[PDB]
DNA sequence: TCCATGTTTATCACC
């Protein structure tokens, strides 16, 4: 009867995602004026696509594929999603057509028009942008080929940065008990996130989960705002650990277990006893997600 | 028969709805100032009378013949011949009352308005189907068209009824980006939207390339939110008749703007000057409540929008126009601080940090001097005259001990070290000699030099002007 | 009677019938506020129907309430241009007419925009039963809301109020909607709203009574 | 079925990747901002070119080479003699146009786009540098013979630094088509990487 | 309910 939600972090590495809308001879990335600075943003859609790709990669059946069409990219290989089983991974069976299900009496099921599961937010960077640049050559394909050569060869610029990406999870819904196996597989796939942004093959970036820590009581989201972290030095502490210490009996530390895999490195014992007696295990995020899923599916 | 209509500005949800009322009022007034209109009134008994003209409400009475005459005036078009640079002719609308007020050199302002009308609002062939057929008619010969008027007149009988919108007007009531559902509207509102384009102001934007060519693309549309209908219709006849006649190639000088906000703010400057000239009008807010800015561009068969804005016309930006006229004339990158001014944005121009984006673009292409030497000085700190005297004394002492093309050598010498100063984003050596060449301000040197940022990029700029 | 505060890092309130290019308003619409309040109450919508339209909401029975809106700090906005789910507006043809399983096949990206931060002090005048139901929902058994806690009496801020045809406004919102169903109707009449910057409680004119 | 990936480094030595595009009087190499310091960068394109060159060296069938006989940079064998039947690492290169060998549909049924099996990332240094270090000099002209006629008499300097640096790379395992003798040659050639620089 | 089309203009203001 609870809806636990988490927050992930990623190891620093040069950025790869490019957001298009190229101006002049450079491809740029959208920025937000958080405090008058620049930051990197990855839209939730690409992450949803990566999750669906992982679910189709692990053998879970589905009815939606986007293939490399010769003309322009499109999504196909779908049918009537009358059963939510074996279709749509219990999420977003969108439909707008009027001639649907022979006017719906033969379906005898909800059209899945707006059933939304696994709501998710959009990732933000931790460091500003300082106007970097890497050169680009793109020589003409040939001087004699039958295939065209773009009539010229032009050199261009790029920009990259090294930055982590904090991320709220916002998993909700006590009704996802029909297929516990599907939920466990989805959680494992999230634990095995990689190649989330379809940026490009070279200079690739991957979302390696690290210090993925958040829990809450069977209430709605509150408490720690799922943000407010430093530049990878020490992030969860000044965010919420002082509040947890000051509210060891006010905010429930029994269910809200410890935070940060870094506890494996400094101040392991002090955090081990004088914080709380809850399941503060942190060895691999895989087993953490496994036993958290077991507890969540228990009640 | 006789048809009477009444309208109010307290229920219109869109600014274009209000603009169309003033547009049609101006069209009716223009009709009242034409001898052939009176001839038609005498012969065919044309009825077109404005009953109520006040601050808020409006009334009108008209017959079928009056509607036909209004359609003939508004939708008058002619044919123009263009040569490629094998002949081709282009149908162009007359423009209505615009020809009656444009006395500029060659009516170049009219040319800009006509191009936008055919190009974006009328991209759909519908303008051409109606426009081409209408073209070449002679009012003095009694030529008229009434096939389309009959449908509109029949529709106008049930003004309370509903009918779908179209892409000729404001777009969006088509697919609606979600669900196959139409829009809600009423007939007489759609009819009023047939004349909002005339009141609109047109500006031509452009994008800088590496070579500095003014690559014009798209258009900027300004839409005013009329507060007092009675007062608004009086100032405009002189506002549009006092436009600057300066011409630059195929476009007027004022027609060239960088950011969309330039066109809207420039309109406020023009109106207040005419307010100072046309008595009976006070503040800008008493005439205009809001200003709409639209950026549009047509590519192939589709029209792409870039920005839609509507924000708080004010009167404290008058000095800004004079601040940029005497400043932006020489360079081309001073527009950045102009964009800077337009809870923590009141006096943000004091810092005016226009160094980041401006310097990166102009690195390679526009590098091809001391005009911009002092520009980066204020950005380096984020004190000036003292360093100038120090540098002057060192060179004077050097030549004293030893006792027409130096400008070109001066430009090259500083460029060699200004460029390297840009990349830094030894420095205590040359100043060490200069100080040696030389006291409260002397104490302040220690506190203004020990900062790492000051050491990195501040102290190594002013001394370069010597040699 | 009593009112409450809320905050969130990101938000988006798209005006309806935006068309190709999407926009937003600095303050959420009244209808969105009512939807949020109903959702937090734990009461489902009166309509349980599926089809072309899914906002068939007769006003026969619905709890009454008065709603005010506050605003403590101005917020900027940013824009992102990734992708959009197009609805076909042209005869088209080909593949779309072949599969036809909730197709929405044609895809073309244009634009949209979002906010940078949100923090509001919402005012409510409601019967006691509705407030108790809200308390039970919050305490009992799309990046829009982050956390909620009632700090009504302190933390004063500005408010909004409709303006009559006099003087001039400042920093006012463009459009606002009271009640709407996505079918042929009259929508809403009052559109223009303006804020007033003063510390004490909002005037009696600031409170607006929703027909629903 | 068995994905793999590694990270490798090298021995310390003076830097080599001299971009040298800043201005006439300097040769500035690419830099990155890491934790407030500046570090050297080598783009992945150089490593891709070096791997292509070594695949040329080992007597492996190829579909791309340079000519070095044109006014500007040009590559000829990439698109001139090849129907893109089989690339070097199965890249199966692409280019967009109104038509390309009848859209490369009828003659050779292949996807318009490419595959990009191999993956790589940027190479970053391990310790920063300290500004300009080395000096230089240029001759006057051809002198008596009038063929160069530069009339420069210039005197400039470039930038060098001493640093060893490391980079990672990856490789999927499910791609096992024509694998036994193609990819293992590439993996063997990963051990050499001699001529990957800009001079 | 379903059949249809279109573009044509070059360039300028500082010490």
Residue numbers in the entry:
A (entry chain B): 3 to 301
B (entry chain J): 7 to 91, 117 to 373, 379 to 404, 410 to 423, 438 to 458, 469 to 490, 495 to 507, 513 to 541
C (entry chain A): 12 to 152, 167 to 237
D (entry chain C): 3 to 201
Which of the paper's sentences describe this entry?
Type I CRISPR-Cas systems employ multi-subunit effector Cascade and helicase-nuclease Cas3 to target and degrade foreign nucleic acids, representing the most abundant RNA-guided adaptive immune systems in prokaryotes. The stoichiometry of SynCascade was Cas8b1-Cas7b7-Cas5b1-Cas6b1-Cas11b3. Taken together, these results suggest that both the “GNS” loop of Cas5b and the “GVP” loop of Cas8b are responsible for AYG-PAM recognition in Syn type I-B Cascade.
To elucidate the detailed mechanism of how the Syn type I-B Cascade recognizes target DNA, we incubated a 59-bp dsDNA target containing an ATG-PAM with SynCascade in a 1:3 molar ratio at 25 °C for 1 h, the unbound dsDNA was then removed by SEC purification. In our full R-loop state structure, we modeled 6 bp of PAM-proximal dsDNA and 19 nt of NTS ssDNA. Out of these, 9 nt of NTS ssDNA were directly located downstream of PAM, while the other 10 nt constituted the PAM-distal region stabilized by the small subunits were modeled using “A”. Comparative analysis of the overall structure of Cas8b in the two different states showed that its CTD extended in the full R-loop structure, with an RMSD of 6.7 Å. Comparison of the “belly” in the two structures reveals a pivoting motion of the extended Cas8b CTD, accompanied by a correlated motion and rotation of the three Cas11b subunits reflected by an RMSD of 3.15 Å.
